[PDB]
DNA sequence: AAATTAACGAATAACGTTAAGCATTCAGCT
DNA sequence: AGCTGAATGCTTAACGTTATTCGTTAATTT
């Protein structure tokens, strides 16, 4: 707690895309998917699919869990920041 | 080879500790059908649930989500995996 | 500058959905379109189509220009406030 | 408060007449005046294309008019365009709501 | 004797592919 | 000695179709 809710397209576009110049359209067919599908993640609108993470790992010689792990961590502190306070009151802890 | 959402719940928490989904429902602040859907194991794991789930079970929310994403991954691995390797061309 | 930009779905969900109770799914089939198409306007992601505005006028017994006029006014002070400063510098006035 | 509609008019029609041919020169100088490339511009005089929202802000500047001017006739175009075009299909498929 | 788990059904909101709309860089005129 | 109409790429819009989440009835289970 106390840091930003970082999205996947942030660790994509400003990390990989900047080191080697990637074009969303060319990247799409490189991934075997339609352009908007790709560009919707670059638009930070998300999200990363599980089949998506699997294909990404192929291109980038990483593990598919890599692209998925930071993705889920986003939502957590997205919703934690959005409605997170509200769920705590309704839920009562168990032994 | 994969691990399901409800397999690590029903076989760990629901059976070896407490009572059934009805009481668990209002304890999690959601309706009953939402809960047993995971016990019925056909999917339905919320991201929002994990935040709620960590609370009852004194665990981290990250715990329940880590196996969740790993689920989709391993299921689809044999499922769409063959199609994925061929269609996707490697990058530098 | 001088006012905040206002989206169509704002003058929709508030003035209309709240005054007479609307439901995005039912409004969808009432408008002859798929639900997300409708709810994407309520989500204020945008945006109002020209064929759409014509459809709305039928349901709401208003003119189609009503829904379109506020649409164009939005983009105007969206872009005016976003990149608008950059536009003024690059454009040179004519007689 | 009734349809259906009649003949539309595009922005590039209201461009070449009243603005482009009268008192003025064409797309080469006009491009650089608007900060955009030539093809973007003549596409409207040729009427193949739409009127941008970003352009309307730029046109108001050159022609000492409001940006709303150019955008108002733009939507009226699409509305009137689609009015006879998809109009038959739209009236039938859409059923009026409580009002 | 009596809740309750499993099943229908609608809501919204994802993801996705498809199709259209937009500004640079080579070719054909004026 | 030019500059407008084509041809191609990018992105972003709009849309439809297809999946996950709560009410409510029905069947179950001491």
Author numbering:
A (entry chain D), C (entry chain A): 4 to 98
B (entry chain E): 7 to 98
D (entry chain B): 1 to 99
Published text:
GraTA (Growth rate affecting Toxin–Antitoxin) is a type II TA module recently discovered in Pseudomonas putida. By sequence similarity, GraTA is most closely related to the higBA TA family.
We determined the crystal structure of GraA2 in complex with the full 33 bp operator at 3.8 Å resolution. The total buried surface area between the two GraA dimers and the DNA is 2234 Å2. Each GraA2 has one of its HTH motifs interacting with the central TAACGTTA palindrome. This “central binding” HTH motif binds with its interaction helix α3 to a TAAC half palindrome. In these distal half sites the interaction is again directed towards the DNA phosphate backbone, and no base-specific contacts are made between protein and DNA. Binding does not affect the conformation of the GraA monomer nor the relative position or orientation of the monomers in the dimer.
